[PDB]
Amino acid sequence: ANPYERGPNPTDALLEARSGPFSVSEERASRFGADGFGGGTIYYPRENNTYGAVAISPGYTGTQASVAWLGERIASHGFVVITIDTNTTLDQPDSRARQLNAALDYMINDASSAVRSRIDSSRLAVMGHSMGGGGTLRLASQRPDLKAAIPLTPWHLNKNWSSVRVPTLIIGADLDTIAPVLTHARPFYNSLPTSISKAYLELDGATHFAPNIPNKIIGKYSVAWLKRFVDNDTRYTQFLCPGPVEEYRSTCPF
Ligand SMILES: [Cl-]
């Protein structure tokens, strides 16, 4: 059996719905009370159990509100999720990486007992939009013990992520003019090791701000990636492999 399995056997409809089956509550992490980042909102399942934990970073000039819909949707599938604000809205990717790391530590050690007791601190993931997606890549290369990483329309000036060993799903936007897939998302995916679990999903007819809007495909494949790799939940493999969307690549079957 799999002791990390939660919720029903998945279907396309259940993954595309506005919320998963877990009702979620919220707990604030205030800016001054949060060491190493600018605070945020922790979404957690009311159902008492232990879950993987996920930290999500917005991009340049962005606040947690630009990723709020996605933190809540992922939590409604059985995860503890914090959407952070950064120290400043101008912080750069490698700074956002340290803030993502501090946010994981915050949920584990500084949040209330209701939050901490719902976390399996051995099962963690990071995600990020644009520069926060670059921060995701940087933290992943620094922390090989992370279970999953999901950069969303990522932005970074370093294109060499061959040091990343964390199962990584990159989501690009074909019409992105701020982080063009040709010079960001695609070289990122290609430079990740051929020997790790990884995938590249390029959204069709989407702009750089597609991750900031409730999006059926982003929620579906983000949850599937997290279920498969944070929860070891192989009921979700058949949605990642062979996969769907303008372009899809992967090291399926994994
Ligand atoms: Cl609160």
From Swiss-Prot:
Record keywords, A-Z: Disulfide bond, Hydrolase, Periplasm, Secreted, Serine esterase
Q: Which Gene3D superfamilies match?
A: alpha/beta hydrolase (3.40.50.1820)
Summarize where poly(ethylene terephthalate) binds, as residue positions.
Answer: 60, 131, 155
Name assigned to this protein: Cutinase 2
Phylogenetic classification of the source organism:
Bacteria, Bacillati, Actinomycetota, Actinomycetes, Streptosporangiales
**Species whose genome carries this gene:** Thermobifida cellulosilytica
Task: Name the catalytic site residues.
Answer: 130, 176, 208
Compartments (UniProt record): Secreted; Periplasm
Question: How has the protein been applied in practice?
Answer: Shows promising applications in ethyl alcohol distillery processes as it may be utilized for treatment of molasses wastewater. Has potential for application in biological recycling of plastic waste products.
Query: Which Gene Ontology cellular component terms are annotated?
Result: extracellular region; periplasmic space
Recorded GO terms, molecular function? cutinase activity
Reaction(s) catalysed by this chain's protein: a butanoate ester + H2O = an aliphatic alcohol + butanoate + H(+); an acetyl ester + H2O = an aliphatic alcohol + acetate + H(+); (ethylene terephthalate)(n) + H2O = (ethylene terephthalate)(n-1) + 4-[(2-hydroxyethoxy)carbonyl]benzoate + H(+); cutin + H2O = cutin monomers
Q: What family is it from? A: Belongs to the AB hydrolase superfamily.
Stretches that traverse the bilayer:
none
